[PDB]
Design a protein around this ligand. Structure first.
Ligand code: HEM
Ligand SMILES: O=C1N[C@@H](Cc2ccc(O)cc2)CN[C@H]1Cc1ccc(O)cc1
Length: 394
């Protein structure tokens, strides 16, 4: 006798498990057990993943309902699971989007200057260098302080909440509440700080005093700052880190992008497609009985949309494990999701990775791992797959 298949399969972000293609072929929707002990439906084909993400009856908000089967414990208040819905209901979606575009004057130059400064410091210090802790994550942090309009010196402490805030735990996490409440207090102070007049927080600060937003809660305004900092920093830092591994393990591609940097955007789109940064499927709770492939999902059941299931599906992306810069459907991957909850920071995430990679290839054309790849230490029970350190030489 064996127990029901458990998720996630592996915390490693450098290889996709063979089990993914086996499930996709044999049972592209099948029952699994999550870390909390709940059962869920794991969806692993492109066709079924998109079906779920495109049907709002598979609800993100309802995953926070008391008594629901859970993928993991909440690390935020339950209402914050509906964060984007709350922002939209407050009439703030357009303003938040506009504030997080990479097209803001001087923003791309700031990303370039910051990436170049971080790389120059690594070169001065000498190999080995840690590309996660001393490149990708500080670049993500600096970017988000700039986008938010908050002091660069405040970034490191906000960043240190993230190793806990983005845990994927079976049980509630006491430290997550301590950090959440403290970070909310910080953002509430930013809204009242007369010096904060730029970026997302400067815009929220002004809208907060505009009569057309007088009944939007101060709780929501502070929550937008904490959540966009956290989601953006963890997602960009983690994606860039693991994309650097994907690139370092593909020296022919690395050489091609070094030689022809105009191919970097197409390269980043493929690095997004093959990315294993999301450690768990995207969760949704069924609000009705809905047929998904051979399974009638019942109201109240949990569904997990496995992004690498979709993104490595050979029926949608032939030769899925290969980075091919001339695919006919290059942006049709699910790295930023699909449907109602499509990533609001997608353009900024793409630009962060493009500039980070462009700068690294110019500064360190000979970049390579400084340890055998198996020696990377993959963070466990986390919402992202990331190596704890990424030691390189050049
Ligand atoms: C490479 C970088 C990024 C990746 C791969 C990524 C990926 C994703 C994915 C897959 C989703 C959909 C989740 C779902 O449907 O359950 C999402 C949602 C979200 N992301 Fe991103 N993200 C990235 C960057 C960012 C940035 C830069 C920000 C903000 C500054 C951001 C903010 C958010 C937020 C707030 C949501 C929730 C949207 C909703 O619920 O409607 N992301 N992201
Ligand atoms: O915008 C959001 N949208 C939802 C997206 C979501 C839903 C369910 C999950 O299992 C994971 C993420 C959750 N809260 C935020 C993301 C977030 C989470 C934790 C933090 O400490 C900071 C920012």
């Amino acid at each position: 006798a064996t127990v029901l298949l458990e998720v996630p399969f592996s915390a490693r972000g450098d290889r996709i498990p063979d089990a993914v293609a086996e499930l996709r072929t044999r049972e592209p929707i099948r029952k699994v057990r999550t870390i909390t002990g709940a059962e869920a439906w794991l969806v692993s084909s492109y066709a079924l993943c998109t079906q779920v993400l495109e049907d709002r009856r598979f609800s993100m908000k309802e995953t926070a309902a008391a008594g629901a089967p859970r993928l993991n414990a909440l690390t935020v208040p339950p209402e914050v699971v509906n964060n984007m819905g709350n922002i939209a209901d407050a009439g703030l979606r357009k303003a938040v989007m506009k504030a997080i575009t990479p097209k803001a004057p001087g923003l791309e130059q700031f990303l370039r200057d910051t990436a170049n400064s971080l790389l120059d410091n690594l070169i001065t210090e000498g190999a080995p260098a840690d590309l996660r802790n001393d490149f990708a994550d500080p670049l993500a942090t600096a970017l988000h302080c700039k986008v938010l309009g908050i002091p660069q010196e405040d970034g490191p402490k906000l960043f240190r909440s993230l190793s806990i805030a983005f845990m994927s735990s079976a049980d509630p996490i006491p430290a997550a509440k301590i950090n959440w409440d403290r970070d909310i207090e910080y953002m509430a102070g930013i809204l009242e700080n007369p010096n904060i007049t730029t970026g997302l927080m400067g815009e929220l600060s002004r809208l907060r005093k505009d009569p057309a937003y007088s009944h939007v809660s101060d709780e929501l305004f502070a929550t937008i700052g904490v959540t966009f900092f956290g989601a953006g920093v963890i997602s960009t830092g983690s994606f860039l880190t693991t994309a650097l591994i994907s690139l370092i393990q593909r020296p022919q591609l690395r050489n091609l992008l070094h030689e022809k940097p105009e191919l970097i955007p197409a390269g980043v789109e493929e690095l997004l497609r093959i990315n294993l940064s999301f450690a768990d499927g995207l969760p949704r709770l069924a609000t009705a009985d809905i047929q998904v492939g051979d399974v009638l999902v019942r109201k109240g059941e949990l569904v997990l949309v496995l992004l690498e299931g979709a993104n490595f599906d050979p029926e949608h992306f032939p030769n899925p494990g290969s980075i091919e810069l001339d695919r006919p459907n290059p942006t049709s991957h699910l790295a930023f999701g699909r449907g109602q909850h499509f990533c609001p920071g997608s353009a900024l995430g793409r630009r962060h990775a493009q500039i980070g990679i462009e700068a690294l290839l110019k500064k360190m054309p000979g970049v390579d791992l400084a340890v055998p790849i198996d020696q990377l230490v993959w963070r466990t029970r986390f919402q992202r797959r990331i190596p704890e350190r990424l030691p390189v030489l050049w």
